[PDB]
Amino acid sequence: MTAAYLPSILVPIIGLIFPGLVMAFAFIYIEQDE
Amino acid sequence: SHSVKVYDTCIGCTQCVRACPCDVLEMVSWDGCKAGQIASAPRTEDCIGCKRCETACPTDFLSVRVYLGGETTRSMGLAY
Amino acid sequence: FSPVPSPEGTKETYWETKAPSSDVLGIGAGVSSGNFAAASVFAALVGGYCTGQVIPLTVEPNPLFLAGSFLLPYSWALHVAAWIQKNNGK
Amino acid sequence: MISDTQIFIALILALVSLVLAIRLGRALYQ
Amino acid sequence: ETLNLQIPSPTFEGSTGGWLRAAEVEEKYAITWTSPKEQVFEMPTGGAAIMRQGENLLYLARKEQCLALATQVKNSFKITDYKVYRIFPSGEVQYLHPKDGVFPEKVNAGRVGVGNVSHSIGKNLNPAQIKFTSKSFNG
Amino acid sequence: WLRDFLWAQASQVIQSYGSALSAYGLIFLGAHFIWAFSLMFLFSGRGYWQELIESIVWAHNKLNVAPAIQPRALSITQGRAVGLAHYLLGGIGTTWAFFLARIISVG
Amino acid sequence: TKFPKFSQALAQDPATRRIWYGLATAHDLESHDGMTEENLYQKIFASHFGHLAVIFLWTSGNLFHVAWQGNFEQWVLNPLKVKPIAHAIWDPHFGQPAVKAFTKGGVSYPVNIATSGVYHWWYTIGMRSNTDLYAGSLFLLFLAGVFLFAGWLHLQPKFRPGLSWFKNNESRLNHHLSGLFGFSSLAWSAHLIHVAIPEARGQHVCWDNFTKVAPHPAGLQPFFTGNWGAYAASPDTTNHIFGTSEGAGTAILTFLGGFHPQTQALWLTDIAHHHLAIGVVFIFAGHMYRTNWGIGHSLKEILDAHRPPGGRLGAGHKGIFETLTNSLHFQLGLALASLGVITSLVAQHMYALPSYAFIAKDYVTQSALYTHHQYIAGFLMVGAFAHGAIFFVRDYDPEQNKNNVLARILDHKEAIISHLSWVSLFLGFHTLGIYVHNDVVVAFGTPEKQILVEPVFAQWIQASSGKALYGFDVLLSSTNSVAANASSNIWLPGWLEAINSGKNSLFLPIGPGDFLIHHAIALALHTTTLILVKGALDARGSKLMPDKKDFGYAFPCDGPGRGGTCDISAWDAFYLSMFWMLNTIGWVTFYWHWKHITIWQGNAGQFNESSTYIMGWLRDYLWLNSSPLINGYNPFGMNSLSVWSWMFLFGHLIWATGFMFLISWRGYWQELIETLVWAHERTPLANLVRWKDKPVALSIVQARLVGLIHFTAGYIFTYAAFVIASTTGKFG
Amino acid sequence: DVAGLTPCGESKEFARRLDGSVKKLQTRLSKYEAGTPPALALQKQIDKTKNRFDRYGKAGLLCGTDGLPHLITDGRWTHSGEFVIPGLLFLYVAGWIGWVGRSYVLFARTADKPTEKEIIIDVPVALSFVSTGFIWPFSAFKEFTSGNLIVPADEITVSPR
Ligand code: CLA
Ligand code: CLA
Ligand code: CLA
Ligand code: CLA
Ligand code: CLA
Ligand code: CLA
Ligand code: CLA
Ligand SMILES: CC1=CCCC(C)(C)[C@H]1/C=C/C(C)=C/C=C/C(C)=C/C=C/C=C(C)/C=C/C=C(C)/C=C/C1=C(C)CCCC1(C)C
Ligand SMILES: CC1=CCCC(C)(C)[C@H]1/C=C/C(C)=C/C=C/C(C)=C/C=C/C=C(C)/C=C/C=C(C)/C=C/C1=C(C)CCCC1(C)C
Ligand SMILES: CC1=C(C/C=C(\C)CCC[C@H](C)CCC[C@H](C)CCCC(C)C)C(=O)c2ccccc2C1=O
Structure with a gap:
């Protein structure tokens, strides 16, 4: 996945x-x- | 509060006044009917909305009508 | 609850008579009952002929016969207008 | 495939849409 | 007329059904009545109490509780001497029932009719007629 | 509980058709029916049913066949009692059929 | 004390009822304090822009998550073997077996497999790479911003339209028929001709080259000559491989009928000619009404003149024009009824005539799409009747409607309600009697005593469309017939090829099981219609409450007098019909799904024999197909059906929790809550904390709504988990 | 035949139904001795099964692919004995019951206590009524045309609306 760090940042926040x-x-x- | 109305079909039987658990209704003088009296709703701020008055009314469609409205502590029946 | 708008030229068309007022015919309010009746038969015959000529439809239909085939439903509206005009004395 | 820069463009446009949604919601709320 | 705060309360052993913090911060109701006997009655909020011979006084949270007890005393002990008050935390005491000395089911002069509608109930206005209008549905 | 008890052990009631245990298969289905039918009385209110009965009474008046014992919707309490009776009858009946066909076949 | 700013009666309630009621009344702008008609129409206009923006953000999100995390390019290479990906999973509660079990789709991360069909739709209309999926998602984000801004703009003092604008029926009808319906259908015909069909034939056409690549070799010259049939020449061959140049033709508007032999979908040139002809017809329809130039019709004049002279309709439609124009609820009821019928047509015609390539081999997508759109259909139909009831209570004036069709409906409402009662009972007694007949007689070992009625009427309709399966020679089925001979040169060969192959869902073979389930569907329809019609026609008044209109649409009851009046409001007839809508869509989707999984396995005889009694539905459909679903996890492991296996139980829980709100009523709960209020006030260290809102039990109507929501949500989640997991687990 | 169906007398699947139904009874009979009551019970059930299958085969019923009889109810006269004639018999009985019940409710209205006649039925009068129903079509249509079946709309109570 490209920009694979995004789910682990945004899912806890959202x-x-x-x-x-x-x-x-x-x-x-x-x-x-x- | 709740809104309580008395329509001019009231036969002055006083049954609504006796059945009300919160002293909302009372009898006033009126020449329209044979009994010489009509029901009145001077204290609707105390009306809890039980509709025991409507149950008591014997006219074909109720002379007394309760219209449930905004809720307060009194009309919600809250002792807390 | 507020005034409902209608286009300019809106008139009253409610009728309880034998036939509606000729205003319900719009631009055809002045045409005679004989002229609608003859147009009715003419459109029915020409429309039926043109429709019949293209019943087996091909990839090359004659466009005049397609356009002329629309005269059959138009003839129904024509004979209704003929009855309306005959019963309005036109 | 999609680059991360392309994702960041999408996030910018969605941020602009969030700002416009807030303004429309405040206008509707009065 | 005013509530004599010193009237002795009927003997009672307490219950959890009594009034809560809303009585001491919003309003409380009181009822007084005369008993010819020292007799047991049922509290609206719980078990049984004993009304003392002479004048009794209770405190309840709801007006309906004071009137349910009033209905009971009249029906069983034939005590028609009951006066119901509202009490605010400011100390203001508001006499409630019977409002003019006469029971509501008996007619009285000087009572003005409130809520009386000159037509029958079927003659009210349709909701559409009074939509976006302040006019009342009672004609 | 769903898979290894209800699903696994309902095999005997649902495969019972054509055998001596087919009565239990029929009572399994019939009790499912009565249980569901009870929810008509439990989730509903008397005022709807009295207003429906009014139109039915009208159709009887039209044919001059209205009864002299005026039909009423069941009382509020009786709607509750009928709903509870058919609920218990259906649920206990479904278990009665399930338990008996299962243990007669395997035990 | 200020949350319901639109309602001073609720903002002064001191209980927790204020929060619930403020949330549940927020969108009912007509009842908000001090609402004029100007402001009602302008807030509805702005919130329609906001709803459109929500729809565009949802579509862009699906395109973006497929572009980013999907396998669209791999699926495009091999669409029958690759399983399309919806979006990736990042869940920190997962165990490592769960991470491995969800790592399907050919990717290196756990993922959800899409059941929406968006892959087949985007492939059919042209999308080939991830970069044009991403281009489409940015366009929808832009459109969402444009419509959010337009909603804000038309709330500004100079841009707020007047009521005279909002009630211009003729200009809105002209523009919505000729522009919104017709011209956008013409533009979609252009997209298919210019992009979708060329890329279905191997030729890429995008914004970078679409002005220098002709859709047809001749090219807009036959159009300007009347040689239109030159555009149907050389259609796609039956050897065509979709997406590639092999076997491809040059036609753009040919009418062939039937299905593309490899995609099992309608030809893209049939679809392009469909949308061209629809576009022309709708543009013509959009010139009917008079706006500013003296030609056209007044809607008021047409309605006023249509009173049959025999007098059987009374005053006819006199005064209907004003009644419909002034009532937004009447408009909503007409719109929702029309929409409900269409989403049912969409469900029926998209499984029988699929337009997307390689869909109808995606049995999970086909099942989910049918179920989805039938449930949407049932909700829209209930809403149409609910807003008709709200119309009669709130917006109907009997004096502007003297002797109308509307007033005469209310004048014979007992004839209507009693004949629905009779037909519902007539259907119910005998459909259930035949089902229980066959159950009882099959149980005793005698299936040959079953009452098995052949659905000859529907079989004759199938034969009239050319089905040669029942030996009826009427109409198209006959080799020689005026109907058969007329269509022979155009669509008839391809339609007969499509309808007489037993390899699709076009006019599926039917028997006694289909007869019985059709009558059950008819019973369910007529009974839901009964409850909703009875609610609409008794909304204004009845014999229990002759003044029911003075109390509104949703009120709890009129008390225990006159025998008891629970569920007497028109709202309660919506409430009661919601159970029957759920029941009917259950019967419909159970029938569709069982018939299709038996056909897809190759075992249609299992449906044919077991559908005629109810134990066949219980063991051969629910019990037999439950096993892959309930084994999604077990003491031996878990697989990717573990989530549906959890949703299944989740659905059973919510549904049953709804029973608590529907069976037990307010008085019990208010007395419990009073003992909890006492205990909090008497507990030390806890009475330091005080409620701002006095805790009360839910209201009577609110509890009905909460139980209905729990029931409905459990219904949807349980069936969705079943229909998706059983079809996935079987693949057939 | 009709709708691609096969007459049950020549359907092979019907024959396999009859044979399987008899083998199932014969294997239960294989566990009992000749003159026992369970043996006579099962032999009478095998005779009943064979009789039913024979009667169905010779009746003109049509079997499907599943070997079960199917009913044709479109109105054709070669198949009127499956719905049209049972339906005529039903409507004669149902109209009888309705006509007789209506006659008794109209009698009970003219009684001293009309509601006591409905919980305590006057059995001699009610039997006089049950006998009258055999000519309900003529009695009810003459009742209709003489203006005594249908009451006019203005003697029926309706909701205010
Ligand atoms: C309705 C649209 C929609 C929906 C339901 C989802 C759903 C999801 N997205 Mg999102 N996404 C969307 C649009 C949407 N996406 C769009 C348009 C973009 C481009 C900007 C993204 C960009 C995006 C990223 C970068 C990531 C997700 C992720 C996710 C997943 C976890 C939730 C999350 O972290 O959100 C975070 C989402 C955002 C910050 C984007 C904004 C969301 C949209 C634009 C708002 C929609 C609002 C809606 C209309 C109204 C909601 C209010 C409601 C109460 C009425 C979830 C499957 C995460 C993921 O893949 O985890 C595995 C993740 O990392 N999304
Ligand atoms: C040509 C000019 C034009 C156009 C294009 C529109 C377009 C629109 N107007 Mg209208 N409007 C116009 C002129 C126009 N208006 C005029 C002149 C006036 C003044 C008289 C108005 C007054 C007006 C009001 C008062 C309102 C609108 C609204 C709307 C929007 C309707 C909601 C929507 O998106 O439906 C989209 C509908 C379609 C695309 C067609 C319907 C499709 C049917 C149901 C079936 C399609 C099936 C098909 C297979 C789809 C496949 C989907 C795919 C996934 C396969 C829509 C954008 C409403 C709105 O939302 O405001 C923002 C609204 O409140 N308009
Ligand atoms: C399995 C459950 C079930 C069943 C069978 C029914 C059945 C019915 N409902 Mg109910 N309903 C249910 C659940 C159910 N509902 C639920 C859960 C709800 C949501 C609260 C509703 C809400 C509802 C409403 C709001 C309405 C109905 C209506 C109807 C009728 C529609 C079908 C019809 O007209 O003829 C079908 C007739 C039958 C199925 C009757 C069966 C025949 C019986 C079993 C004969 C057997 C006699 C037998 C000898 C008795 C033995 C007794 C023993 C003690 C000896 C019917 C009485 C409508 C109605 O009454 O309109 C006329 C109506 O308005 N229902
Ligand atoms: C009110 C009752 C009712 C309703 C709502 C339906 C509804 C339906 N039927 Mg059913 N049907 C009925 C009665 C009904 N039917 C009866 C009584 C019969 C005869 C046994 C049939 C035989 C039948 C067949 C054979 C088929 C359907 C099919 C269908 C569907 C398509 C429409 C159609 O063919 O209508 C049929 C409508 C009628 C026949 C009109 C009946 C109206 C009258 C008033 C009912 C009472 C008639 C009466 C009992 C008989 C008179 C006496 C006679 C014995 C002398 C639809 C679900 C078709 C389908 O899709 O199946 C999958 C199909 O193939 N129906
Ligand atoms: C599946 C259906 C269902 C469920 C879950 C409940 C649940 C409950 N009922 Mg109800 N009830 C039901 C059906 C159900 N009932 C039916 C059909 C009837 C009809 C007669 C009733 C009639 C009834 C009465 C008359 C009474 C109850 C009572 C109770 C409570 C028992 C105390 C308890 O267990 O608290 C614990 C709560 C639960 C076990 C609920 C499930 C919670 C689980 C553990 C998960 C929690 C997840 C967590 C909160 C998620 C947080 C995050 C999320 C918010 C995002 C509880 C609230 C009694 C009560 O209130 O007294 C205390 C009581 O007097 N019920
Ligand atoms: C304690 C037992 C229990 C209970 C209470 C439930 C409760 C529920 N289950 Mg579950 N289930 C259970 C055990 C249970 N289940 C077990 C042991 C299994 C096997 C593992 C399943 C398998 C299962 C599946 C596979 C499905 C359910 C569904 C449902 C829901 C039915 C909703 C409704 O209103 O019915 C409405 C009922 C119907 C619409 C039809 C009833 C089913 C009949 C038998 C088939 C249809 C017959 C035919 C079409 C109609 C005849 C018409 C008539 C005129 C004769 C509800 C959540 C279903 C669901 O979500 O519904 C949407 C669903 O799909 N459950
Ligand atoms: C013999 C008396 C009688 C007669 C002539 C009718 C006639 C009618 N009923 Mg009524 N009805 C009756 C008794 C009767 N009903 C009783 C006792 C009940 C309570 C179960 C009902 C409940 C009922 C409903 C709920 C509905 C009708 C409807 C109808 C109409 C259509 C036919 C129908 O649907 O039958 C249906 C019949 C039933 C559902 C039940 C009948 C039960 C038995 C068989 C009849 C009673 C026999 C009685 C004991 C006679 C004894 C005679 C003896 C003393 C000499 C028609 C007006 C429908 C309507 O209004 O459509 C226009 C409708 O919706 N009826
Ligand atoms: C329901 C509802 C309520 C009220 C009414 C209503 C309004 C009509 C309706 C609508 C609701 C609607 C339409 C709601 C719409 C909600 C939307 C569209 C929310 C979008 C959020 C996007 C965010 C937070 C992305 C931020 C990206 C950032 C900060 C990236 C920044 C950057 C990166 C890293 C890279 C570039 C540089 C920088 C700038 C540094
Ligand atoms: C409750 C309420 C109160 C008052 C206000 C209100 C909102 C208006 C109202 C709501 C009312 C509601 C919600 C009403 C809902 C109404 C609905 C859902 C009506 C459905 C209509 C469908 C029709 C007429 C199909 C016709 C098909 C045909 C003729 C096909 C023909 C054929 C062709 C062409 C091709 C095949 C062959 C054949 C078969 C020959
Ligand atoms: C259907 C229904 C009715 C109407 C139900 C009626 C009128 C009962 C119908 C009985 C008929 C008249 C006889 C049929 C009886 C059965 C054949 C067997 C009954 C067995 C015992 C009665 C002996 C209500 O009155 C009601 C009230 C409150 C909540 C829910 C409901 C409710 O759901």
């Missing part, structure tokens, strides 16, 4: 950091009074 960050910020947005 699979863990991206949902962890959207859950954190969605939680902040849905639990704010203003």
